[PDB]
């Protein structure tokens, strides 16, 4: 990812970072993707997943 910033105590020196997405697609926001799911499963619970397994 991006190199984390280094603070002298007053100012913050940071490398710019846009080298992640050249031409491919922008990376999906995990906080927004989990919000639309939480509107879909409001209070409802999952059914038990598989067969006979621990």
């Amino acid at each position: 990812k991006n190199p984390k910033d280094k603070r002298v105590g007053s100012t913050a020196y940071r490398v710019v970072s846009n080298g992640g997405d050249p031409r491919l697609a922008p990376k999906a926001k995990k906080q927004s993707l989990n919000l639309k799911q939480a509107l879909l499963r409001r209070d409802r619970v999952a059914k038990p997943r598989g067969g006979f397994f621990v």
């Binding site: 697609a25 990376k27 999906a28």
Partner: protein
């Protein structure tokens, strides 16, 4: 013509999803000699981000990106034809503000923001245009708002009640679409399908169809059939009741999928009327319309 051949797959990266897809097709241009140049069709998408992506199907990769200072875009659509060369995308989002992007002459840029809701907790989940200048958006706070795109104003705030089936009082209008005669069809969190009047923007009918929430709608091109796909893996088909006008009723329902029906879209031309419904079991199911 019924072959259904999968041509190109353009994969996105890791931690990248695709939520909405919109084709933008120009009208038929004519040459000097009477020959027909058909509409160049451009594909736009969102990826649960603040960025609308335009895809280059010639190079099989993403062509452009556009983003404004707003929340994550959850729904978007291209403005329908009445202008000719000046068509614009309208996109709802999480924090509320209906952003409006411009597309002309191979461009995709964040033009402006029409309006935003007063309440910050209003999330825009679906969008459909009634005419050239009237945008119908569903929201998470039990409302279906009807904005007017030119001045950015608000015609009327349609509302829906609580859900009295479980908790969580706010109903969520997952899918709106517009009939050709002006009415608005909306499937929501209760599994209902509401028919809203077109001139007055009030409801005319509530059709209780599904058990879990209706996730996607589709409307026939002549305005004769409504297909509704929910989270109870259920697909229901409605035709108008004979006699009284504006009254729909569920002809029949059937569980075609094995998981929820998250998206569907219709097509009606060259001797082929289909509606393709894709869900969470990765199998696109083609129904004859």
């Amino acid at each position: 013509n019924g072959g259904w051949y999968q041509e190109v797959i353009i994969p996105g990266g890791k931690d990248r999803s695709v939520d909405g897809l919109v084709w933008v097709t120009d009208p038929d241009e004519e040459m000097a000699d009477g020959k027909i140049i058909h509409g160049k069709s451009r594909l736009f998408s969102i990826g649960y981000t603040t960025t609308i992506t335009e895809w280059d199907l010639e190079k099989a990769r993403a062509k452009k990106h556009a983003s404004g200072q707003h929340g994550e875009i959850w729904c978007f659509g291209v403005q329908p034809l009445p202008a000719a060369q000046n068509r614009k995308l309208v996109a709802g989002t999480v924090d509320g503000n209906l952003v409006l992007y411009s597309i002309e002459d191979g461009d995709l840029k964040f033009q402006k923001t029409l309006t935003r809701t007063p309440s910050k907790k209003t999330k825009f989940v679906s969008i459909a245009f009634q005419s050239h200048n009237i945008v119908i958006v569903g929201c998470s706070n039990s409302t279906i708002c009807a904005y007017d795109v030119r001045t950015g104003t608000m015609l009327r705030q349609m509302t829906l009640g609580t859900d009295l089936t479980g908790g969580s009082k706010n109903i969520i209008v997952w899918a709106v679409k517009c009939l050709p005669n002006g009415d608005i069809v909306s499937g929501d969190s209760t599994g209902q399908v509401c028919i809203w009047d077109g001139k007055t923007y009030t409801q005319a009918q509530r059709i209780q169809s599904h058990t879990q929430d209706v996730l996607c709608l589709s409307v026939s091109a002549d305005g004769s059939k409504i297909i509704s796909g929910g989270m109870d893996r259920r697909t229901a088909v409605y035709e108008p009741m004979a006699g009284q006008s504006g009254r729909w009723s569920k002809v029949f329902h059937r569980r075609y999928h094995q998981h929820d029906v998250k998206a569907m879209a219709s097509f009606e031309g060259k001797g082929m009327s289909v509606v393709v419904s894709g869900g969470s079991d990765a199998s696109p199911i083609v129904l004859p319309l």
